[PDB]
């Protein structure tokens, strides 16, 4: 009967001394439990959510207006910077950008392109409002 709280919002929102139980062993484990546990905590994190380019609650796409190649390059630069920060160095030994590969046809999801293949220089909801307002008729005087 004990309720389980939700974590996300929703629609509504004799002697008894055994002879061999004394603790006297002193063992130091190698590798260390704390270090292995920290590494496993880091490793078990799930992957992030890449929702850019998908429609929203109303129907508009989500993201920012950047060309696909530029978005890919910016993401590579951000990944390289994050790697450098993690390794605690000014520059990173391993880089996701400026490699020797001519990967100039790469494309990434962006908020500039809708699901129909058109541009999002004007929101879909506003476009629909335009189209439906174009055919309104009024009460005679």
């Amino acid at each position: 009967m004990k309720r389980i709280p939700r974590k996300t919002k929703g629609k509504s929102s004799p002697a008894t001394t055994e002879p061999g139980t004394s603790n006297r062993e002193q063992y130091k484990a190698r590798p260390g439990i704390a270090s292995v546990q920290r590494a496993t905590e880091s490793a078990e994190m799930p992957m992030k959510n890449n929702d850019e380019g998908t429609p929203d609650k109303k129907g508009n796409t989500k993201g920012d207006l950047v060309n696909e190649h530029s978005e890919a390059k910016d993401e590579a630069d951000e990944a390289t910077k994050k790697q450098a920060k993690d390794t605690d160095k000014s520059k990173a030994q391993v880089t996701y950008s400026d490699t020797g590969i001519n990967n100039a046809n790469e494309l990434s999801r962006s908020g500039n392109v809708d699901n129909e293949g058109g541009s999002n220089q004007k929101p879909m909801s506003t476009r629909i409002a335009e189209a439906t307002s174009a055919i309104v008729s009024k009460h005679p005087a």
């Binding site: 207006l65 190649h69 530029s70 390059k73």
Partner: protein
């Protein structure tokens, strides 16, 4: 990168700063076909797409170029001359 833009609406002749005039002249004369030109109205729309739905110098002024046409209305009709 193809996310760069150059703002139009000011004639390249009328640029006050001379070094910037030279830079813009050379760029437009060499790479004319691969430049993205946008109007100030387009810039304003980009800025306000979704949201919309001390000492000050006294010797700086804003100037505009005015367009007009000479019209002869000698008769009830109109005649555009120039």
């Amino acid at each position: 990168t193809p996310k760069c833009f150059v703002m139009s609406g000011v004639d390249i002749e009328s640029i006050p700063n001379e070094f910037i005039k030279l830079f813009y002249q050379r760029v437009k004369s060499v790479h004319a076909n691969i430049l993205n030109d946008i109007s100030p109205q387009i810039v304003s729309d980009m800025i306000n797409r979704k949201r919309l739905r001390s000492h000050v110098d006294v010797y700086k002024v804003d100037v505009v170029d005015m367009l007009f046409e000479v019209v002869d209305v000698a008769d009830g009709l109109r005649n555009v001359s120039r």
